[PDB]
């Protein structure tokens, strides 16, 4: 990825921060794909997460090529979801979502999945040809038992709004999260170590 | 505890980061009790950390009291230690020492213990009277097998010098930490979740 044009198809600042801290230089182009994929159409939660990441990266890759006839070398897509009791939780639409989300997560152990799509692009015969490599990472997170008072003070904090499941593991969410089991950067929004292992296999 | 005077008996920036982000208003008064306790005098590594956290907070309490003869209401002390194969790792003494702790932790799993002492004070009868609550938190951490040029470049960073085991969690772009099993903020240096639950048992 040394001399290649890397595009990250997500406006999530925590994702950019993770990849910026790792040394990766990239362009930020948020995707216009809106995640209305039928969740019931997938066998596993991480299947829905990986396919969503694929579609977000492909929409960005095609929009860019259609705009100025240049194929970006790599487009990276990602989608972070939360599963508790088999149900899929994404980012809240408001607070009545965020509160009921944290209401469901209170006192249980849930799974965080991030599906990642690495899209290699090239242009051939006036068409954008794409090679997609998908992977996911799972991290188990355990919430403490949360009173409806602290549930509400955290709902209100503005924190839950653009986080999967309506919470983070830094800042105010540390009063909610009791333990983390697995890759913690996966919970923030990006599985960095798995992402690195996927690069060396795609090249060596 | 919403109208009291709170003091953090530690100079670690991450420790004040975690509690400031939680909404706690407090003063930072570094303790001048040095972590010189006899390890062989304890049965467990967490007993050592808790007592070390205890004396460090008790030193600040006495120092604040002898200066003003009015007690700070609550003094918080903490001591983070790392154990790998039974050996206790604390803050390193120079760059080659931190280099050594990283290469022993490289590629394998270790334990992170943070003992915390909450010292309730009162100065009503013209004397410092204390009542201390001790607890600890354990998190298992696994490191990647990272290259050596990278570990010494992390050592010449100055980053390992103020941290137990010679590492922060953002070490090497977030690539050093492979996985986490237990409280996440415990690895950063303060078990915030356990700390808030310890406050509710002290008051209600
Ligand atoms: Cl499903
Ligand atoms: Cl896991
Ligand atoms: Cl709690
Ligand atoms: Cl002991
Ligand atoms: Cl011991």
Swiss-Prot record, chains A, B:
Point out the annotated site residues (description: Important for substrate specificity): 14, 80, 170
Q: Please list the residues that carry the modification Phosphoserine.
A: 12
Show the segment(s) annotated as MAF-like.
2-204
Q: Changing residue 79 to A/N does what?
A: Loss of pyrophosphatase activity
List of catalytic residues: 79 (proton acceptor)
Q: In which tissues is it expressed?
A: Widely expressed. In adult, highly expressed in pancreas, placenta, fibroblast, thymus, prostate, testis, ovary and colon. Expressed at lower levels in spleen, small intestine and leukocytes. In fetus, expressed at high levels in the lung and kidney and at lower level in brain and liver.
Name the residues that span the membrane: none
Q: What is the effect of changing residue 12 to A?
A: Loss of pyrophosphatase activity
Q: Note the superkingdom of the native organism.
A: Eukaryota
Record note on quaternary structure: Homodimer.
What else does the entry mention about this protein?
The gene coding for this protein is located in the pseudoautosomal region 1 (PAR1) of X and Y chromosomes. It represents a unique fusion product of 2 different genes of different evolutionary origin and function. The N-terminus is homologous to the bacterial maf/orfE genes and the C-terminus is homologous to ASMT. Exon duplication, exon shuffling and gene fusion seem to be common characteristics of the PAR1 region.
Q: Which family does it belong to?
A: In the N-terminal section; belongs to the Maf family. YhdE subfamily.
Q: What does this protein do?
A: Nucleoside triphosphate pyrophosphatase that hydrolyzes dTTP and UTP. Can also hydrolyze CTP and the modified nucleotides pseudo-UTP, 5-methyl-UTP (m(5)UTP) and 5-methyl-CTP (m(5)CTP). Has weak activity with dCTP, 8-oxo-GTP and N(4)-methyl-dCTP. May have a dual role in cell division arrest and in preventing the incorporation of modified nucleotides into cellular nucleic acids. In addition, the presence of the putative catalytic domain of S-adenosyl-L-methionine binding in the C-terminal region argues for a methyltransferase activity.
What this protein is called in its record is Probable bifunctional dTTP/UTP pyrophosphatase/methyltransferase protein
Q: Which gene encodes it?
A: ASMTL
Q: Which residues of the full protein are shown?
A: 10 to 213 of 621
